[PDB]
Design a protein around this nucleic acid. Structure first.
Ligand SMILES: Nc1ncnc2c1ncn2[C@@H]1O[C@H](COP(=O)(O)OP(=O)(O)O)[C@@H](O)[C@H]1O
Ligand code: BEF
Ligand SMILES: [Zn+2]
Lengths: 252, 365, 781, 64
DNA sequence: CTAGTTGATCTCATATCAGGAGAAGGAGCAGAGCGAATAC
């Protein structure tokens, strides 16, 4: 077995499968858990982020670390096309987990609210869609979830979208986003994501705009003056240092 | 005391005993200095003082006129009477002088080569002490009431800043990131203080009559909210769980960092268990303060009993932290005292007040 | 930068801790004695003690306790160092080879914290589930043992009571239960908690807090048949078990407070109790069919003033003392016809607190000889030390000696002494001051429970008999003594600085300097001088008397009228406690400003502050090594050498040398115990060590430094404590590495390693050259 | 003409109160926040703007 | 039962002076009236 800093053990057979960067990601995820802070697994598409999350959760439940003993009831919000993908990966990698889908397809065949209640009181993994999180925000946030992993969490990029406001109602500190492209149009998206995972680091949206978005963006235009380019460089370096501990982005 | 020396020589008592007993005796014999003077350079009241944590030689003082004076407290002359001469000065002619009152000045911990100063001109300036030039400036949308660097952090170098905004700013002196803020207060944050014990624990006191302890690494707001009654008057947390019945305008962790002393505008000081914020119900009587800005007060170190020196009108009230018993009033200022800073090496005190004076209190005999 | 060589001439002898158990073997009954840095392992034979090992810890052993985890064949030893190095050690004997393997180690120093008043406390759960340390106020550190660590990871539990007097683990409790006495403004109370390692926090104790005696100072955890605890205070002994509350107030323990205890039986039916006056009592627990019936205390007898004591077997008790010689005594079943059942079997020499010492070339040889004021109230004595191994004579004074000086012309020692009288006043025992050949009392016209009576003893320097004993004024403490001839007259005088001590004040306001002449077997009072404070220190300065009244260092001239006349004063001191001299220069050791290089400019007639150290070191002693090197001892067990640097910055003395001796140096003195190194400064400490400081040359010091680093790479310390950390200058507000000082013990350990280890040391001259160098270094002591 | 003024020392808006002691021909302007106080002579034609004026002038003159 | 097709509906995302009159509030002064407070 692999023994990390304080009390976290991930099983040896599970650990051996993971690559070097994947177990580095598990290390980073548990450092975030110790800090009680969120993060973005920014590893590009295909590098393996479902596996890193599954391994980290398996080691968290396995380690019996100290409300919740080990792993509590977690909710995984992902696009509709990959819900059963998450189910398959969980079953193959850590079969002990109970992994239910909150969706019309689903497996429950009763009232959904009963399913959320069962997973909350059984410390299972509830995989749901972003549409359901928007729709069932009344029920989804009454149960004190432990982990709120958002797969392809760049869907939260619009700070004013109903899905974003819904996903930002979870009380837990352990907020994780899996997205190999956590910036798609501008820095407002980065602010929205970092407001989700760690509300404070990048300040209020007006402040983030004035301090980072206008300097960094305006220095990228073709007609940028050299002084303005250097100002954009300074702001970009500041932002990179600011977001370094909570963004883990490995390339291919 | 010859008993103390004899016990130390004979090994009956640990030298710790003599050291702390004599420190306490010196603090109790605090009096207006017979042979010491401090050079007068501030045109306005001194709002803040800070003796450097290492070697305790140099003292910073920020005045209401915006100048920052750097004094040498050592008696480099051969006489028994000396004046604490001013080594350096951010005067009115300095290109980077604060345009308004300097409200907090703090030496960089772990090294005397840098200090910081925050002003009501909405700036936290970081100064190189050698060249005496601003190494950095952090601008804020609203006036700064207080700031504090962690006296313990070998890892982080965050400056916690409390402005009239309801947000506690955390300015990273490592690559400059002032974007981090803490939400949960509702009015001006009149005092901020890092825990001397825990690296990432910050106590913030705001005009909403609340004191909050934050683990700045954490993503889930404040750790503890201090409550006068500890639960006797319990209500859903929207307006209850107040630390004081007024503005909480001063914070000070005790020397060990296991307790927190909060002074508020309800004419009350309170002592709180720093681990769960429980009120220890130490009385302290009535502690007169009506300051509309942060109130700077300090605690003693290296003594048998811990003392707290609180500005009390135009005086310094010395209290015993864990019993609340009133030791004395140091009475030598002509206007309200704004700050007092304690030299722990020799149990000395330096108080700055609105009368443009820095008065030194030394143990008698 | 300075170059200094410190070496231990005499190892520490005061015992600060003794524990018994099965450490070396499952069958052996071991006695582990902690002298300050030295751990001595003896095997308790049928007669006496057989030393099996003596290891030198890189640390002052503050805690020493034996514990047997489940499945362990023999006891493991937990040692905590004053600098908070914790180690669990095991004894592994491989034939001739003996090894103390470090089973676990770590450092438990909190970065910040008020060190507790009553000192470091270390306890172990009786079932060995954890180690509880009280190092700081308001905290209780816990080192779990069930979780088998090799790093001794610990966690603090916050303790709501901030002034804890004593704490123990209770017996027969399903959970680790601590019972402790604490002081709050309401009084002293005994409270209980149940520590939870899983939740890492206290829980409500088996029985609630109970208000105990005002001076309740000791907690004794009674074993399983009774359970509960016994609280010993100044006036009463109480026993609590939660609903059983027994209490006694034996009048025989009222006279002195009980400071140590030990459990005689495995079931705790009998305990030993030592008081500060040396009395040894037996506290007996009478059982009833089990619960506890009644408590009895009976005075077994008198021993040395016991810091600690341990019952070995067969009525043999090791009384380990810090103030006097340690003892191995026998508890007879029947009295000795004097009301005492205690009989001393053996005495282990202890240079007690070496408050003062003088080097004398007695017998007119070329050999030095240390005469030391050793010990305390009942164990006070003079010790005469020579190289013969070190031969140590003992002259019991039966009163505390304070200062000593040699008057060669008169062939006598002047010794300041102090005895306790209880009532007008009555002596508790016949002391050396009262057993003088002739005696006198001061009749001074200047001034007009238990008390200290101070005397000047004139002691013959051949037979060491008290030729004379001059008693001082009532409530007068003699602080300083100097034998010198002043001015221009030929007579040699004993000049004694005194202070008037009354309970109504914290600092003496009155005192006098008395000049005696010892001639014709009589001590005539030649002169007096009323001064306005305690004369802490005096020295002869170019035929004048340099004294230090409370904060003023002033110079007196001896006139033709045979009286003292002030010539100059210096006032820039908190309290000038220590004075030294070389030429026109004076070195003033201050209580907390730590040094002041003063100069008496004779062309004008006043002092001049040449330089000062502005670091706040609290002093215990001070000395002048060279024209520009100044040795000083801080109360935090550190040595530091200041140097006159090379403007106003010239007034700053530079601390060019730093070192953590681990001993409280009480006195320096130039001299050597023997017939390459420059100078020789012997020093005496509280735990009895005598050390020696010499100045080295630059290249030689560099080479030695290199050897020290090599040995640190090679020699393995007992607790895996790094030597640099152990010798790092340490104070509650400062920590620096050692500089300008060579640890002579470590260098001299270069002889006690095998040749392959020497070659490992000397990988980069040959080993034989360094053997020659270390031999020459050993020659100086 | 406003009666509450921004303090030149602490820059707190409307934190300065002006007291016209006409019987003694003296105007006293005091900041509530930083407790800075200034006293100037006044006439019957004087107003709080004139007292704040004298305060600003005294500050600038003293800061030369 | 039970999956596949059909419509509605929601979210989200893509850039660049020549009035006047009266009623309600607050202000400052004026005095009346009663409690305490020196004081003859
Ligand atoms: N350590 C591994 N061993 C074997 N297969 C892996 C490992 N990590 C990832 N994979 C495979 O790589 C594919 C991509 O991983 P996934 O996490 O689903 O995508 P992304 O990380 O881009 O969200 C998956 O089909 C998964 O089975
Ligand atoms: F491949 Be994606 F980032 F899940
Ligand atoms: Zn102002």
């Amino acid at each position: 077995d692999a023994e990390f800093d304080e009390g976290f053990k991930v099983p040896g057979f599970l650990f051996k499968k993971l690559f070097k960067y994947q177990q580095t990601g598990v290390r980073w995820l548990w450092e975030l858990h110790c800090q009680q802070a969120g993060g973005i697994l920014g590893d590009e598409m295909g590098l393996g982020k479902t596996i890193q999350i599954i391994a980290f959760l398996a080691g968290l439940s396995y380690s019996k670390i100290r409300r919740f003993e080990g792993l509590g009831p977690t909710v995984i919000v992902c696009p509709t096309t990959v819900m059963h993908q998450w189910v398959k990966e969980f079953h193959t990698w850590w079969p002990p987990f109970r992994v239910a889908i909150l969706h019309e397809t689903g497996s429950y065949t009763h009232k959904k609210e009963k399913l959320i209640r069962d997973v909350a009181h059984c410390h299972g993994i509830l995989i749901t869609s972003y549409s359901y999180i928007r729709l069932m925000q009344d029920d989804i946030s009454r149960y004190d979830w432990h982990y709120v992993i958002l797969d392809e969490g760049h869907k939260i990029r619009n700070p004013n979208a109903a899905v974003t406001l819904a996903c930002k109602q979870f009380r837990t500190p352990h907020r994780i986003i899996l997205s190999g492209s956590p910036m798609q149009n501008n820095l407002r998206e980065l602010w929205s994501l970092f407001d989700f995972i760690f509300p404070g680091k990048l300040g209020t949206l007006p402040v983030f705009m004035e301090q980072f978005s206008v300097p960094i963006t305006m220095g990228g235009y073709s007609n940028a003056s050299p002084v303005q380019v250097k100002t954009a460089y300074k702001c970009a370096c500041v932002l990179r240092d600011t977001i370094n501990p909570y963004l883990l982005r490995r390339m291919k | 005391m010859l008993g103390f020396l004899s016990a130390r020589q004979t090994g009956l008592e640990d030298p710790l005993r003599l050291r702390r007993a004599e420190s306490t005796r010196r603090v109790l014999g605090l009096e207006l200095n017979k042979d010491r003077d401090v050079e007068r350079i501030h045109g306005g009241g001194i709002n803040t003082l800070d003796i450097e944590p290492v070697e305790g030689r140099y003292m910073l003082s920020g005045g209401s006129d915006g100048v920052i004076v750097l004094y040498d407290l050592e008696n480099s002359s051969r006489q028994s009477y000396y004046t604490c001469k001013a080594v350096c000065s951010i005067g009115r002619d300095h290109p980077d002088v604060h345009r308004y009152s300097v409200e907090t000045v703090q030496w960089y911990p772990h090294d005397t080569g840098m200090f910081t100063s925050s002003s009501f001109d909405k700036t936290l300036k970081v100064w190189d002490t050698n060249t005496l030039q601003t190494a950095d400036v952090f601008n804020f949308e609203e006036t700064v009431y207080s700031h504090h660097m962690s006296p313990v952090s070998t890892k982080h170098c965050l400056v916690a800043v409390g402005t009239r905004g309801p947000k506690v700013q955390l300015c990273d002196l490592k690559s400059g990131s002032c974007s981090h803020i803490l939400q949960g207060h509702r009015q001006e944050i009149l005092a901020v203080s890092w825990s001397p014990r825990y690296d990432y624990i910050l106590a913030t006191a705001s005009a909403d009559s609340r004191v909050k302890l934050w683990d700045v690494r954490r993503a889930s707001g404040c750790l503890i909210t201090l409550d006068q009654h500890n639960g006797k008057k319990s209500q859903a947390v929207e307006s209850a769980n107040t630390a004081h019945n007024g503005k909480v305008n001063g914070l000070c962790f005790t020397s060990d960092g296991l307790h927190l002393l909060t002074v508020g505008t309800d004419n009350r000081m309170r002592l709180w268990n720093s681990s769960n914020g429980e009120n220890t119900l130490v009385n302290y009587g009535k502690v007169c303060n009506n300051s509309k800005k942060g109130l700077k007060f300090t605690v003693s170190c290296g003594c048998s009993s811990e003392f707290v020196f609180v500005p009390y009108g135009s005086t310094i009230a010395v209290y015993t932290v864990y019993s609340g018993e009133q030791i004395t009033m140091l009475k030598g200022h002509y206007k309200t005292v704004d700050c007092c800073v304690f030299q722990s090496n020799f149990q000395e005190l330096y108080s700055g007040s609105r009368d443009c004076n820095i008065l030194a209190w030394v143990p008698s005999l | 930068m300075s170059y200094n060589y410190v070496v231990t001439a005499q190892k520490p002898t005061a015992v600060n801790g003794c524990v018994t158990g099965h450490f070396t073997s499952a069958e052996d009954l071991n006695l582990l004695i902690a002298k300050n840095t030295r751990l001595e392992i003896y095997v308790v034979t049928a007669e006496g003690l057989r030393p099996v090992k003596e290891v030198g810890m890189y640390g002052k052993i503050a805690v020493m306790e034996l514990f047997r985890p489940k499945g362990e064949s023999k006891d493991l030893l937990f040692i905590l160092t004053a600098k908070y190095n914790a180690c669990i050690l095991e004894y592994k004997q491989s034939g001739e080879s003996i090894d103390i393997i470090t089973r676990a180690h770590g450092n438990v120093q909190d970065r910040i914290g008020r060190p507790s008043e009553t000192g470091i406390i270390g306890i172990i759960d009786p079932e060995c589930r954890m180690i509880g340390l009280r190092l700081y106020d308001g905290l209780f550190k816990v080192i779990p043992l069930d979780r088998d660590n090799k790093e001794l990871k610990a966690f603090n539990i916050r303790l709501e009571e901030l002034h804890v007097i004593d704490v123990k683990f209770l017996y027969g409790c399903q959970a680790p239960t601590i019972c402790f006495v604490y002081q709050d403004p309401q009084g002293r109370h005994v409270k209980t908690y149940e520590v939870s390692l899983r939740e890492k926090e206290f829980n409500k104790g088996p029985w609630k807090q109970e208000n105990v005696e005002a001076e309740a100072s000791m907690v004794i955890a009674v074993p399983e048949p009774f359970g509960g605890a016994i609280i010993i205070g100044q006036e009463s002994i109480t026993y609590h078990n939660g609903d059983k509350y027994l209490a006694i107030a034996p009048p025989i323990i009222k006279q002195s407070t009980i400071v140590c205890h030990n459990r005689v039986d495995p079931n705790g039916s009998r305990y030993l109790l030592g008081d500060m006056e040396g009395r040894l009592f037996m506290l007996l627990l009478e059982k009833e069919e089990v619960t506890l019936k009644d408590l009895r205390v009976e005075l077994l007898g008198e021993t040395s003033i016991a810091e600690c004591l341990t019952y070995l077997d067969n009525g043999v008790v090791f009384v380990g003392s810090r103030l006097g010689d340690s003892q191995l005594v026998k508890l007879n079943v029947d009295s000795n016809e004097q009301g005492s059942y205690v009989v001393a079997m053996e005495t282990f020499t202890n240079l007690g607190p070496i408050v003062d010492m003088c080097v004398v070339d007695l017998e007119r040889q070329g050999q030095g000889q240390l005469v030391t004021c050793s010990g305390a109230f009942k164990e006070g004595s003079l010790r005469i030390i020579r190289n013969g191994k070190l031969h140590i004579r003992t002259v019991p004074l039966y009163e505390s000696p304070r200062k000593i000086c040699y008057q060669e012309v008169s062939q006598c020692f002047g010794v300041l002494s102090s005895r306790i009288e209880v009532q007008g006043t009555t002596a508790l025992r016949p002391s050396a001051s009262t057993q003088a050949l002739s005696s006198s009392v001061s009749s001074s016209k200047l001034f007009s429970e238990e008390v200290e009576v101070h005397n000047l003893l004139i002691i013959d320097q051949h037979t060491f008999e008290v030729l004379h004993a001059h008693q001082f004024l009532q409530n007068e403490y003699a602080l300083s003594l100097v034998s010198c001839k002043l001015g221009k007259d030929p007579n040699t005088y004993f000049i004694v600085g005194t202070a008037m001590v009354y309970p109504e004040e914290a600092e003496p306001k009155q005192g006098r300097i008395v000049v005696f002449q010892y001639s014709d077997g009589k001590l005539q009072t030649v002169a007096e001088k009323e001064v306005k404070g305690a004369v802490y220190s005096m020295v002869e300065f170019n035929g004048k008397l340099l004294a230090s009244i409370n904060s003023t260092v002033r110079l007196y001239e001896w006139t033709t009228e045979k009286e003292l006349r002030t010539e100059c004063n210096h006032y820039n001191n908190i309290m000038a406690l220590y004075l030294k001299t070389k030429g026109d220069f004076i070195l003033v050791g201050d209580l907390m400003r730590s040094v002041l290089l003063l100069a008496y400019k004779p062309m004008e007639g006043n002092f001049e502050e040449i330089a000062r150290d502005f670091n706040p070191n609290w002093m215990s002693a001070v000395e002048i090594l060279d024209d520009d090197n100044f040795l000083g001892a801080e109360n935090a067990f550190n040595l530091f050498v200041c140097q006159k640097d090379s403007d106003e910055e010239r007034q700053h003395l530079q601390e060019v040398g730093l070192f953590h001796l681990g001993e409280f140096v009480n006195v320096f003195c130039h001299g050597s115990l023997v017939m390459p190194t420059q100078g020789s400064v012997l020093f005496g400490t509280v735990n009895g060590m005598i050390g020696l400081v010499t100045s080295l040359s630059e290249s030689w010091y560099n080479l030695l430094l290199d050897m020290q680093n090599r040995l640190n790479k090679v020699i393995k310390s007992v607790g895996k404590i790094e030597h640099s950390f152990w010798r790092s200058f340490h104070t509650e507000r400062k920590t620096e590495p050692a500089t300008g000082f060579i640890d002579g013990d470590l260098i001299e350990s270069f002889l006690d390693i095998s040749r392959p280890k020497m070659q490992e040391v000397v990988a980069n001259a040959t080993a034989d050259d360094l053997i020659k160098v270390v031999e020459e270094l050993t020659r100086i002591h | 003409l406003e009666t509450q003024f921004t303090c030149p020392f602490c820059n707190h808006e409307k934190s300065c109160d002006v007291k016209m002691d006409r019987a003694r021909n003296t105007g006293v302007i005091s900041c509530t926040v930083c407790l800075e106080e200034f006293q100037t002579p006044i006439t019957y034609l004087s107003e709080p703007v004139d007292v704040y004026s004298d305060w600003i002038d005294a500050c600038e003159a003293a800061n030369q």
